[PDB]
C-alpha cells in the first residue's frame, strides 16, 4: 500500500491522474519524482521549469554543479539528484525532443530508466514542449516500465483523451 490517491489504474503497474506534478509531489513526498529534463539540465520550462521553480531554484543550482563535473546527459539517459522539498530523489530523464529532431525510438530507452526504481511519480516523457504525441508516450510507458509508475497529466482535456483512447 502507498499514499498515491485518486489514480485510475491502467495496467498491473501503471496508474494515471489529472494532476499538477508539482502539487502532487508536494503532497505525497514520493521517494522518486521524475523530471522531464534536457541533456544540459537547464530547467527552463515545461515540467522542468515548474519543478525547479517549486524548489526556489535549488534544483538548478545542484544541476549546474552536476553538469560542471560530469558533462551533459545522453538523450535517453538519466541521473539521480536530490528531490529537494518535493521528493527524496529526482530522477532527471531525457526523452527525445521532437522540436530538436531527436529520434523518437529513444523514448523507449528513456522509459527504461524508470525500471531502476520500484515506485515513481512521473510525467509522460517527451510530451508537452518536447513535441511527441502523448498517446504514443503512454503506450511506450506501459510497454516498457515494469515498476510502479504514477503518471501525472496536467491538462484535463489531454487526460480524458489518454484514458478514452487507451487500449
Which residues sit at the interface with ligand RDU, rule CB under 6 A? 20-22, 46-47, 50, 123, 127-129, 134, 152-155, 158
State the Cα–Cα distance between residues 104 and 16, nearest whole angstrom: 22
Contact assessment for residue 98 and residue 132, using Cβ atoms and an 8 Å cutoff: yes
In which region does residue 163 sit, left (phi positive, over 0), alpha (psi from -120 to 50) or beta (all else)? Answer: alpha
In the complex with ligand RDU, which residue's Cβ is closer, 140 or 152? 152
> Considering the complex, what minimum distance in angstroms separates the CB of residue 59 from ligand RDU?
14
In which region does residue 57 sit, left (phi positive, over 0), alpha (psi from -120 to 50) or beta (all else)? Answer: left
| Closest listed residue to residue 16, CA positions, set 134, 122, 119 | 122
In the complex with ligand RDU, which residue's Cβ is closer, 18 or 113? 18
Crossing angle, helix 46-54 and helix 21-28, to 10 degrees?
A: 40
> Considering the complex, what minimum distance in angstroms separates the CB of residue 29 from ligand RDU?
16
In the complex with ligand RDU, which residue's Cβ is closer, 69 or 152? 152
In the complex with ligand RDU, which residue's Cβ is closer, 63 or 71? 63
> Considering the complex, what minimum distance in angstroms separates the CB of residue 1 from ligand RDU?
24
> Considering the complex, what minimum distance in angstroms separates the CB of residue 22 from ligand RDU?
6
Amino acid at each position: 500500500v502507498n499514499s498515491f490517491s485518486g489514480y485510475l489504474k491502467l495496467t498491473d503497474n501503471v496508474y494515471i491522474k489529472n494532476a499538477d506534478i508539482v502539487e502532487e509531489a508536494k503532497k505525497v513526498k514520493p521517494t522518486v519524482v521524475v523530471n522531464a529534463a534536457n541533456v544540459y539540465l537547464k530547467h527552463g520550462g515545461g515540467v522542468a521549469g515548474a519543478l525547479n521553480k517549486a524548489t526556489n531554484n535549488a534544483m538548478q543550482v545542484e544541476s549546474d554543479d552536476y553538469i560542471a563535473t560530469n558533462g551533459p546527459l545522453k538523450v535517453g539517459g538519466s541521473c539521480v539528484l536530490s528531490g529537494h522539498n518535493l521528493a527524496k530523489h529526482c530522477l532527471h530523464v531525457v526523452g527525445p525532443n521532437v522540436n530538436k529532431g531527436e529520434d523518437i525510438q529513444l523514448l523507449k530507452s528513456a522509459y527504461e530508466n524508470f525500471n531502476q526504481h520500484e515506485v515513481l511519480l512521473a510525467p509522460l516523457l517527451s510530451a508537452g514542449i518536447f513535441g511527441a504525441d502523448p498517446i504514443h508516450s503512454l503506450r511506450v510507458c506501459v510497454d516498457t516500465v515494469r515498476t510502479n509508475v504514477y503518471l501525472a497529466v496536467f491538462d484535463k482535456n489531454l487526460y480524458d483523451k489518454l484514458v478514452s483512447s487507451f487500449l
